[PDB]
Design brief:
mainly alpha; hydrolase; Glycosyltransferase; 51% helix; 15 helices; binds chloride ion; two-stranded antiparallel sheet; Beta-galactosidase; homotetramer
């Protein structure tokens, strides 16, 4: 009935076919796999890490909740138990579900989403892994340094992996972290927007990667008081504060993109990532730093409306229960040359505020009308203003 | 049933007629029900009338540039044009009750640029028929605006537009104002169809309200005249115009992808009270017939019509006198910025540019088509979008 | 005997053939004129405004001094008397020495140097002109708005002319001033250096034009702001511009070798001691940074001046400057260069605008940086200024 | 015979270092001096600064084939000492084991060691025994612990990894690629780069930036390294541009030399003496002087500057080591990070000794340099910006 029940129902529906199969080493065996009509010929086994890593990144906050014996609590325990077995299989070289770690550049991407999952729920998803599994993750993450990343948002993947290694107490490469955060800052364009590399692209990679991962990296550096070369006293915290303020502005923009009937603009590449476009707004919500311009109720209501409208299309799922290539249903020609149905699991990134308890104000507060909904009703709605000075 | 044009001309007439009928007889200030922002900064309220008239004429000038005919629409065009010609004369006659506020404030540079836009968009129909005394008055009023030192923002284009008009009119003009402006606008291109409104990027619709339409219009006149600009070789101005057009084509693709299946669009940035003025680039691409291959005329007409019908279904957009009110969808006065009055609202006229294509043009007669988001949310095929990174 | 006497002797030698001839409308008649071997074919009459304007810009501070009846005082009076008549001829359409105001783009350049002369000595060079002459200057300066300048240091020429018009109480174009100062600031590269337009060039146009004119324009704007309102942002801009020029001055002093030479790079190397205009301006306006003493600056500049102007071939038979650097080196002249252009070397003379009994002139000689260094003596570490 | 002056000076600088280090007595015997404003770091950094900077500058000279001339005898002696020195430098049991494992400064001087190996691989790297080679590889690799300043130091990391790549060891392409991107981004124009995000008017363009950028790109181009999102020919184009920029900087440096063999003193680290001419020396050694510069004029100008600066006996201490200063002993000129080992960057002027004694660079007639012609009142060329790079 309540918005939360819709969200947990959908998250469970997305997660369960992946995790139940992978928990017993049958993901590759059973997963109905689909590649772009313009697939560039790369090894199709990249699909499984895309699927698993992107999924776990998005549902890790949910699974970080304390255990209880409610219906939702039982689902969380089941998903988490499956996930823990899945993590073990993913790095066991003898498992049928051993992921493609050692070839291709793409694993850096999806390993960063795995790292995200551990950073978002360390006590629940990392700490319970056995020591052999932990050692395997450390080794698999470290060997990704073989990849020379594109000079784009991919720099954050390298930073995320090394940040995880740092936090896990393993040997890490600070240069990869520091070089990345410098470039991301250099790529800030203004009024909440970053360039995806040296040239500005009007697309949702600000949501898919840039702002959420930049904030996450800076948060770990700030929390550890990591000694960064030529950072004055307070400087890392100041960088984090600026990053958060920029993402707050981007969140205001994203909420104003949601139409009265729960749609949003479709532009830029990787439009098949569906509700992944809202990761910044979901992150602001989960971490409880929505700007004063946005109430929890309005954000929950707008995101729910968008989610219900998009996932009313049954053709988003195939017979096996896996996500298909598309946006609203099955639209395979929308898939870029680098896209497979594992890639689709980036849509899980909308679910971050499920990491707030069921009795948190985000979930229990009254529904509110979002900006465009008010506007087209002819009702008062707020003026918007640019944020410079960031 | 299937006549989008009739909806557009009906709305444009409804917006234009109360302004032009009153101003044609020097009674705009007498009769216009005027409204200022709740946070009005205290400037002289007479700025309202130039905002109203200038912004209106900019948007309907293409429509009124059509050849005369004796259809119902043709009769409306003749009536509007006759009123407009008398209005232009009153606007610069120092003895007219409707003499505009030319000589005080900075704001007149803004709205004079929209007047200049109207003359550049329909020179034969709106400029040439003015009597010689009126023309000389415009030239003098435009020239004295050089007293204004503009903000280092989109306002540079206002100065450029006025000077470009003066150049085209055969008057004394200041090439430095034109050239410095076009250099800055180019320097402010950020990428993938977007410019900064000055040195700092703002995510708002000023790319639509001012920057891209006026940049393209200035470059078009310079290219057409083969104007000798410092260190621009033969063909160099045309190359700048080609780039400007390509950037605006990309911005047009973005704007079409902003239109929701139910005819709404995102609301962000300042001056959201400009309503359908957000679509000026798409309307300009349509009118000047350089929509990129990604966009069909039918899909653009259909999407714009849907947005227009939905927004102007709100009766509260108009007051008792027939003038636009402060708001977006209806009367939402607190949306008005400190610099906004109900004359400012007439920038919504900038959607009407493709009315300058004849009624029997393919833009108007082609079958309706579904726009991008409408296809997408139906679960139907819709195109991949791609950044344009090379401009 | 003293350094000052060398400087005034040279300034007089440079100035007198120009001003004596032009004062009686015989500059074009008598001036032995020389153009670049690669002269681009423009009207050669540009030469006379280049000569007169660049000269007056550089000697205006000297001639701004109060009168006295010393030998130097007599030279100042004579030069000023000739200059006043010359200014009148320059804008009288019936004079044989009427300058080329109305055609070409080059007049914007040299008109800016004329404007500089009036801004640097208004009471002595502008105010005594008769009303008809003043009206003619205002009209001639205003019609230069016909020129669409290169997107380079030339923006400052337009700014300088309009700044003069503003100061003179005439109709002026603030947009020309403001757009120029914005671009110049945008073209600051760092550590005292600006780009000459959108592309950095390693040359002395920072000295010839950019920093001295940027500072002068800002100073007038700041003085007008201060005469009103709460301190404006223009004061901060002027402060930054001065600090940048202080750093550039430190760099210029470190360019002077122990034997009074300096590096030769970039275009317009025929401008000779014009390379030192920022250092001369810092000295005249008394804001040398603490790193530089007046004595060391005077000593270094004198050494450079004596060595360069020991070459007799710098002057032709008529007493006019020739194309070259140290002597007659005509192939050094760019396609836009004539011997009138050479008078930009007058810009070294700015500290002659300080009285003969000022500390700049009376303080003990001091060793300059490289002179100390190559003696094996202590000399200061240099530091980048990265915060401007 | 300009060459004999150069080899005499290079030998005088090199021999006290290499003879002592060859027998593990550099730390024992070297008369060491730190800045009056020394920041308190471990003074053992001095020895790697000394050895690495020395070897970088004389490596071209020592790359020449052996012969039976007087100079040939000196080269053989220096090279034999250097080979023993390289072995001691990485032997953890040697008294002269360098400070590899602590401080950030070792990244700097290890890059100069790597430079020496890249400049003379057959003569200085290949003859090292396999244990010594393995030790170098390990010592270079562990420098990845250092998070470099966002400055010219990025090239040190690139240089080390480039050496590792060329040596056939495990290398980090990310360190190389990120560095070359930043250096290109820091090009300001007309031959000048910024030392990091803010332009500094100083000679770090000479000490580090242009010579190391060109060297890194040259190895990448020669190997035909497949770099991320660099199309075929992209690396070659970057190398070509880098060389053209350094040609312009070389023209500028030649025009800095006064008629009496001085040059401007500006920016930090002015104690590096003739290290300011490394780009001009490199252009000469690698034979890509631009047409504006003849070998004769460059040799003559550099010789004049070198003779005038090293006429000051106080440049050397009693032990024969360089002292803190510029022209003599001027210790207050030393920055807080400077010791007398740092001074050995002045060896970077010697690169064209890597051209044989019978090469045109050495045998061509002396020519007058630009300022010398200018102040004589003689014709000299117009200079022009290169704005298109
Ligand atoms: Cl990507
Ligand atoms: Cl939706
Ligand atoms: Cl505005
Ligand atoms: Cl010039
Ligand atoms: Cl120069
Ligand atoms: Cl350094």
């Amino acid at each position: 009935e309540n918005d939360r029940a819709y969200w947990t129902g959908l998250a469970y529906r997305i997660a369960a076919p992946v995790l139940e199969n992978m928990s017993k080493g049958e993901l590759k065996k059973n997963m109905q796999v689909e590649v772009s009509p313009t697939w560039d010929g790369r090894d199709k086994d990249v699909t499984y890490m895309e699927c698993f890593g992107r999924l776990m990144s998005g549902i890790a906050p949910w699974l970080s909740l304390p255990d209880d014996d409610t219906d939702e609590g039982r689902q969380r325990k089941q998903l988490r138990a499956w996930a823990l077995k899945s993590y073990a299989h993913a790095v066991d070289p003898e498992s049928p579900d051993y992921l493609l770690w050692r070839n291709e550049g793409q694993p850096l991407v999806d390993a960063a989403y795995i790292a995200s999952s551990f950073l978002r729920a360390p006590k629940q998803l990392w700490e319970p892994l056995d020591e052999v599994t932990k050692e395997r993750y450390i080794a698999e993450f470290q060997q990704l340094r073989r990849i020379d990343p594109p000079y784009t948002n991919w720099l954050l993947f390298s930073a995320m992996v090394e940040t995880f290694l740092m936090k896990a107490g393993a040997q890490y490469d600070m240069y990869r972290i520091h070089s990345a955060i410098r470039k991301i800052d250099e790529w800030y364009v203004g009024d909440g927007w970053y360039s995806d590399g040296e040239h500005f692209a009007f697309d949702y990679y600000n949501s898919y990667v840039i702002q959420p991962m930049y904030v996450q990296v800076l948060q770990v550096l700030a929390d550890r008081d990591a000694a960064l070369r030529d950072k004055a006293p307070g400087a890392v915290q100041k960088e984090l504060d600026t990053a958060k303020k920029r993402m707050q502005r981007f969140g205001i923009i994203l909420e104003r993109f949601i139409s009265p009937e729960g749609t949003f603009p479709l532009f830029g590449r990787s439009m098949t990532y569906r509700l992944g476009v809202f990761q910044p707004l979901s992150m602001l919500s989960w971490k409880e730093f929505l700007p004063e311009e946005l109430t929890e109720g309005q954000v929950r209501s707008a995101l729910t409306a968008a989610m219900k409208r998009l996932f009313a299309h049954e053709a988003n799922f195939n017979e096996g229960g896996f996500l298909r290539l598309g946006f609203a249903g099955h639209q395979p020609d929308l898939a870029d040359w680098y896209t497979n149905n594992g890639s689709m699991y980036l849509t899980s990134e909308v679910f971050l505020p499920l990491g707030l308890p069921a009795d948190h104000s985000f979930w229990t507060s009254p529904a509110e009308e979002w900006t465009t909904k008010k506007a087209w009703q002819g009702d008062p709605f707020p003026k918007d203003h640019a944020v410079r000075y960031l």
